[PDB]
Swiss-Prot record, chain A:
Transmembrane segments: none annotated. It comes from Homo sapiens (Human). This is Thrombin light chain. It comes from the Eukaryota.
Length: 35, 254
């Protein structure tokens, strides 16, 4: 069946887990907040 | 990817490359959803009009990649397939409705800084984020140009952010019968900005970062288009949330 992974899905080792933001993710989030 | 940019290392750790064993070539994109399951588009594996019908032994999946061509020793992971599941209602005859397929790996993969699963959406994430104007992100190793004949090939994984388009504008843009299991994305002619998935990016993920828990969720699968980067035309994506019950039925069945 599924296997491991669900619990920690979607959190990137080199970004979210290190509190670092990639170059263009803010463009995505601002699009949800601004209009 | 047309009009995108180079991905940063580890930016899309769920990105999977579907590779044809013989001849050796990139077939499509896909995504890692657990340590043993990969999600892609049904048309990447089965399309009767082109006498395309790949079996488990014809392909391999490559996870953790950045370079399009280099064998990334000690970074990428090459996995064989145990079984392929195509949605039983995949409509290749008309409109590619339910363009979704699952692939079970022969054995689970270990996660790393470069290999990590994306989340599938829950109903609140779908309700909040699938809205016109909201942007998602598409990644892949497909063509760089809309234009012509080389269509351009990237040295490394490409990324582009694209806005979801209002359903009436999507429907109005094509003669194909669009269903509730599909959505479209891309910039409109007067938005000035460009960007699109192209040939080779099919099957890959359209992801959105949740403002609620800051996890990345796969909301779509690159499905079909009519001229990538062609303003006035938009790319179509399989609506993952709408087909989530089928995904869960398959995974909790094998
Ligand atoms: C419409 C079509 O091509 N269906 C093929 C079926 O005939 C074949 O037996 C199976 C296994 O390869 O793959 C699928």
């Amino acid at each position: 069946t599924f296997g491991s992974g669900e619990a920690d899905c979607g959190l990137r080792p080199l970004f979210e887990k290190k509190s670092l933001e990639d170059k263009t993710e803010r463009e995505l989030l601002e699009s949800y907040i601004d209009g | 990817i047309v009009e995108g940019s180079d991905a940063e290392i580890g930016m899309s750790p769920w990105q999977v490359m579907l590779f044809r064993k013989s001849p050796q070539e990139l077939l499509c994109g896909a995504s890692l959803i657990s340590d043993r399951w990969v999600l892609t588009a049904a048309h990447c594996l089965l399309y009767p009009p082109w006498d395309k019908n790949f079996t488990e032994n014809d392909l391999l999946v490559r996870i953790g990649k950045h370079s399009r061509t280099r064998y990334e020793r000690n970074i990428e992971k090459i996995s064989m397939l145990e079984k392929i599941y195509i949605h039983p209602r995949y409509n290749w005859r008309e409109n590619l409705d339910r363009d979704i397929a699952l692939m079970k790996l022969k054995k689970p993969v270990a996660f790393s800084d470069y290999i990590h699963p994306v989340c599938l959406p829950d109903r609140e994430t779908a309700a909040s984020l699938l809205q016109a104007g909201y942007k998602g992100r598409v990644t892949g190793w497909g063509n760089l140009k809309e234009t012509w004949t080389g269509k351009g090939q990237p040295s490394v994984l490409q990324v582009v952010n694209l806005p979801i388009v209002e359903r009436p504008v999507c429907k109005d843009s094509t003669r194909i019968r669009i269903t509730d299991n599909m959505f479209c994305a891309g910039y409109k002619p007067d938005e000035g900005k460009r960007g699109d998935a192209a040939e080779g990016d099919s099957g890959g993920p359209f992801v959105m970062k949740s403002p609620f828990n800051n996890r990345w969720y796969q909301m779509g699968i690159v499905s079909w288009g009519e001229g990538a980067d062609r303003d006035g035309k938009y790319g179509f994506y399989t609506h993952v949330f709408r087909l989530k019950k089928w995904i869960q039925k398959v995974i909790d069945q094998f």
